[PDB]
């Protein structure tokens, strides 16, 4: 019913919408990758196949968005899903914990902008040039630029920071950060100048201990810098250990174990029921919904999955992927020894 659903999934490519006071508002192509820290988004990826149209539906939740702001995103995803006839694959995306597939849609990386709809902020593209902000650039695999308070308190020796003053962008490189971190932060700074300023802006690379007068004017005198925190985010352990479990959901919700170790057999998946493939140790849980399974139980898959994490004492930041029968992902299918299409 909401106007945009009519625009959704018509042709191949990526479509980003931001939930603005219970309404779907498109996010322009240039703004793709920028997400407000206090907002909820809907990301739809359309793939053309011979005949077929394959959908990868994602709902991104901001760190500062409310419980009710999060609820609206979940409803919109359910409405979008049945609007697309239960053909799409749904994913709950959490800020700083989003999946590889979601991450792969934005080549320049992710930009976490402070504020949101409550601060009156828009994705409406502007020449701008009046901007004053600070971006903390972190991550080796995935480049994440986070909007941090524009002061020396945010700073650390081991990382790269981008001071965006509008007409000029400063790439502050910490004394103890390597070549890879410098290049990645540069790509973000080049991204602002070209994408947001149209190349009018000027890029100045700044070294710690050598900051210009303009920088120390806004920021003030530079004090001692804390040693760069080593994030060393958890990386999947490679072994011959079979860490996945197969569960069947029996309506609150009751989980019954099907298989105590992967590889699973395709026959275990019954069209009459909803299943949970647990790979919680590797940060991923999958909700497989049978074609002849109860429709009310199918719609509550996201809620069922969140309850599963809580019951099995997993982190609330575990990746949730909801799959319809026949719309299984290559990652889900590979847990099976006898997968047949």
């Amino acid at each position: 019913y909401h106007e945009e659903f009519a625009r959704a999934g018509k042709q191949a490519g990526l479509q980003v919408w931001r939930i603005e006071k219970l309404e779907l508002v498109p996010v322009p192509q240039s703004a793709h990758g920028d997400f407000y820290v206090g907002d909820a988004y809907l990301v739809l990826h359309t793939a053309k196949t011979s005949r077929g149209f394959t959908y990868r539906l994602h709902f991104w939740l901001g760190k500062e968005c409310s419980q009710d702001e999060s609820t609206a995103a979940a409803i919109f995803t359910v409405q979008m899903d049945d609007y697309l006839g239960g053909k799409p694959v749904q994913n709950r995306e959490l800020q700083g914990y989003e999946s590889n597939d979601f991450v792969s849609y934005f080549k320049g990386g992710l930009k976490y902008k402070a504020g949101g709809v409550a601060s009156g902020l828009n994705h409406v593209l502007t020449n701008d040039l009046t901007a004053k902000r600070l971006l903390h650039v972190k991550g080796r695999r995935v480049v994440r630029a986070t909007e941090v308070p524009l002061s020396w308190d945010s700073f650390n020796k081991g990382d790269c920071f981008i001071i965006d003053l509008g007409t000029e962008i400063y790439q502050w490189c910490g004394s103890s950060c390597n070549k890879y971190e410098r290049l990645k932060a540069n790509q973000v700074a080049t991204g602002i100048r070209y994408n947001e300023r149209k190349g009018r802006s000027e890029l100045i690379v700044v070294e710690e201990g050598s900051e210009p007068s303009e920088l120390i004017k806004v920021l003030g005198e530079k004090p001692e810098l804390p040693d760069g925190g080593d994030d060393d985010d958890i990386i999947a352990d490679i072994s011959n250990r079979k860490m996945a479990k197969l569960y069947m959901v029996s309506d609150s919700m009751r989980v019954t174990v099907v298989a105590e170790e992967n590889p699973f057999s395709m026959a275990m998946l019954l069209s009459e029921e909803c299943f949970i493939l647990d790979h919680g140790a590797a940060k991923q849980i999958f909700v497989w919904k049978g074609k002849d399974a109860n429709p009310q139980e199918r719609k509550a898959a996201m809620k069922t999955a969140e309850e599963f994490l809580q019951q099995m004492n997993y982190s609330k930041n575990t990746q949730i992927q909801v799959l319809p029968e026949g719309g299984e992902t290559p990652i889900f299918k590979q847990f099976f020894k006898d997968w047949r299409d």
Side-chain angles (χ1 to χ4, degrees):
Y1 55 121
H2 305 86
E3 335 167 36
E4 284 300 295
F5 290 87
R7 320 321 195 282
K10 294 297 169 170
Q11 72 173 18
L14 197 81
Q15 282 128 241
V16 181
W17 297 277
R18 180 212 208 185
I19 324 286
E20 312 213 39
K21 233 84 197 180
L22 337 169
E23 283 203 78
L24 281 177
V25 178
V27 171
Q29 251 198 60
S30 34
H32 283 185
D34 297 15
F35 306 95
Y36 285 99
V37 88
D39 290 344
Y41 294 73
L42 238 77
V43 173
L44 179 85
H45 178 75
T46 305
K48 119 297 243 99
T49 147
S50 256
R51 276 55 307 190
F53 250 146
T54 20
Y55 303 129
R56 295 290 280 99
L57 181 56
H58 303 266
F59 76 93
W60 187 93
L61 297 186
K63 232 147 208 173
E64 321 267 298
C65 80
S66 90
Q67 152 196 285
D68 287 318
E69 284 183 286
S70 306
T71 304
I75 292 149
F76 270 104
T77 312
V78 148
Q79 308 212 282
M80 179 84 94
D81 173 64
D82 70 45
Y83 171 86
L84 290 159
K87 218 200 171 176
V89 177
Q90 304 170 221
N91 287 237
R92 188 194 62 168
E93 304 298 356
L94 259 56
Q95 184 192 319
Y97 307 98
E98 48 276 277
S99 64
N100 290 359
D101 304 82
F102 180 88
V103 139
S104 300
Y105 299 149
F106 323 96
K107 289 300 119 207
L110 304 187
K111 197 180 271 117
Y112 301 135
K113 297 175 108 187
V117 287
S119 293
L121 298 169
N122 256 264
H123 281 293
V124 291
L125 357 52
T126 160
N127 54 336
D128 192 275
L129 309 6
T130 235
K132 7 115 188 51
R133 52 152 180 202
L134 177 65
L135 299 153
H136 191 170
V137 194
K138 193 116 191 136
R140 181 103 184 228
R141 274 307 128 278
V142 281
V143 175
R144 295 192 170 99
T146 336
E147 234 172 61
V148 277
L150 178 58
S151 54
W152 292 116
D153 295 90
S154 308
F155 284 79
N156 71 80
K157 255 180 233 117
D159 286 332
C160 272
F161 298 80
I162 300 181
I163 308 102
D164 183 23
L165 298 182
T167 20
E168 49 269 324
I169 302 141
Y170 298 87
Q171 187 201 335
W172 190 93
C173 312
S175 35
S176 88
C177 74
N178 81 319
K179 290 293 222 189
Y180 297 107
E181 290 182 87
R182 313 175 109 272
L183 182 67
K184 291 290 128 183
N186 189 103
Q187 299 184 334
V188 179
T190 319
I192 299 150
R193 183 196 161 269
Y194 181 84
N195 284 356
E196 283 169 80
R197 296 317 135 59
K198 302 133 72 162
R200 123 167 352 88
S201 238
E202 228 217 303
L203 233 136
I204 308 114
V205 179
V206 175
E207 295 299 331
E208 189 182 327
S210 311
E211 36 281 290
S213 60
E214 13 269 307
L215 234 58
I216 56 139
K217 160 135 198 60
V218 160
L219 289 182
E221 259 198 8
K222 188 200 65 118
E224 230 10 284
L225 291 106
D227 268 293
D230 321 359
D231 99 59
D232 354 284
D233 203 43
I234 312 298
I235 306 334
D237 311 286
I238 293 324
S239 66
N240 288 315
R241 276 174 82 224
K242 311 285 141 237
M243 308 258 58
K245 310 234 142 175
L246 197 56
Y247 293 97
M248 188 202 275
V249 194
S250 59
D251 55 290
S252 346
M253 135 226 143
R254 219 21 245 262
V255 290
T256 279
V257 69
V258 163
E260 224 83 63
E261 236 174 25
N262 60 295
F264 312 116
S265 138
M266 207 188 139
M268 288 165 169
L269 264 49
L270 310 173
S271 301
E272 294 78 51
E273 308 287 359
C274 285
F275 291 81
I276 304 228
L277 200 147
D278 180 34
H279 202 32
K283 278 148 214 252
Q284 297 164 301
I285 72 155
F286 315 93
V287 192
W288 181 88
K289 347 176 251 210
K291 73 204 213 316
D292 303 325
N294 170 298
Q296 264 5 256
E297 260 143 69
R298 293 220 294 255
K299 284 221 179 77
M302 282 297 320
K303 197 234 200 322
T304 288
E306 285 174 16
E307 278 179 2
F308 178 81
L309 296 179
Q310 245 229 292
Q311 188 56 237
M312 301 313 294
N313 194 48
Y314 282 124
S315 181
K316 44 113 164 93
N317 312 132
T318 306
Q319 305 171 33
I320 308 169
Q321 200 180 71
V322 176
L323 328 104
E325 182 170 357
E328 301 92 2
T329 52
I331 190 123
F332 171 89
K333 287 183 196 158
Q334 74 188 29
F335 283 101
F336 300 82
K337 50 167 180 259
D338 58 11
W339 198 274
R340 235 170 249 175
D341 258 294

